Amino acid sequence: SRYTTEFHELEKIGSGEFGSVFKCVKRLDGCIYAIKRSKKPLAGSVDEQNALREVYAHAVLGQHSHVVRYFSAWAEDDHMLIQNEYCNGGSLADAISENYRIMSYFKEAELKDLLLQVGRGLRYIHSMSLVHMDIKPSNIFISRTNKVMFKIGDLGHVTRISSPQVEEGDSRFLANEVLQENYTHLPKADIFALALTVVCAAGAEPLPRNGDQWHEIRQGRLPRIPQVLSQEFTELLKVMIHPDPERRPSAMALVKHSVLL
Numbered sequence: 080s081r082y083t084t085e086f087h088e089l090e091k092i093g094s095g096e097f098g099s100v101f102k103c104v105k106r107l108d109g110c111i112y113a114i115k116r117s118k119k120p121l122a123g124s125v126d127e128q129n130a131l132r133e134v135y136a137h138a139v140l141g142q143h144s145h146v147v148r149y150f151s152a153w154a155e156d157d158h159m160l161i162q163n164e165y166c167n168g169g170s171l172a173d174a175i176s177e178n179y180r181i182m183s184y185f186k187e188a189e190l191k192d193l194l195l196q197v198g199r200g201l202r203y204i205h206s207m208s209l210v211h212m213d214i215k216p217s218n219i220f221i222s223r224t225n226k227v228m229f230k231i232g233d234l235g236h237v238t239r240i241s242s243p244q245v246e247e248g249d250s251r252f253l254a255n256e257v258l259q260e261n262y263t264h265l266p267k268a269d270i271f272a273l274a275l276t277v278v279c280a281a282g283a284e285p286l287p288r289n290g291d292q293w294h295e296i297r298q299g300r301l302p303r304i305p306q307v308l309s310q311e312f313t314e315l316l317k318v319m320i321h322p323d324p325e326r327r328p329s330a331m332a333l334v335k336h337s338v339l340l
């Protein structure tokens with residue numbers, strides 16, 4: 080076993096259909112890695128194409144500060160293994176639960192910090208004629224030291240701008256024009272998803288998957304936030320979920336905004 084040899088398990092940090100993720104040490108280099116172990120997906124299944132899209136996206140992108148780093152993947156005995164950088168602060172989805180439990184939330188400064196950082200990530204990815212297509216707290220990762228680095232993960236849904244093979248992301252974060260199968264402005268669907276991601280961080284109530292409250296949002300109505308936020312900022316989130324995707328800012332656009340530091 081390459082796994083049982085090259086690495087040593089310190090902590091289970093994920094459990095589910097996919098399988099299990101583990102905090103591990105590379106025996107060779109003594110650095111910490113997140114390694115995921117999955118059953119070989121069914122041929123012709125979305126699990127497999129996800130797997131397939133991630134391989135390609137890893138091959139193209141190489142390395143970026145705001146993208147969780149790919150190191151390696153391989154097989155043993157009808158199981159996939161993927162070795163990625165380990166982010167010690169967990170997923171934003173976790174951090175938000177933590178923020179429920181201590182009756183805290185992300186103060187506007189941190190929301191702005193969050194938005195811009197995941198912004199630089201999308202800029203790089205879009206710049207490389209790719210789109211992520213499943214942006215959500217669950218798939219944003221946090222590396223702490225003080226400083227905080229936000230890193231985009233899970234590229235199972237990454238496809239080309241040119242010839243888009245669209246696996247529908249989480250419905251809670253999905254822009255209307257993607258449900259309609261309009262794939263002409265997918266860069267602006269990542270943008271849509273990032274706004275709602277940020278809204279979750281503000282302590283918004285769990286987002287609808289469907290029903291009245293869902294179409295309300297896609298009509299450009301920002302979901303209610305407990306805490307109070309600046310006019311400048313509130314309007315930027317609002318435009319990021321504009322019904323017309325052309326009217327949403329690009330990644331490039333987003334990371335050149337005074338309201339952000």
Ligand SMILES: C=CCn1c(=O)c2cnc(Nc3ccc(N4CCN(C)CC4)cc3)nc2n1-c1ccc2c(n1)[C@@](O)(CC)CC2
Nearest residue numbers: 092093100113114115147163164165166169170173220232
């Ligand atoms: C290599 C696989 C993907 N993956 C990363 O690339 C990645 C990078 N940093 C990290 N850090 C991390 C560090 C602590 C935790 N928990 C959070 C919950 N706590 C109670 C206990 C500690 C989670 C995550 N996790 C990564 N992954 C990953 C860990 C758990 C899960 C996932 N990913 C999933 O998103 C896999 C689909 C769902 C569960």
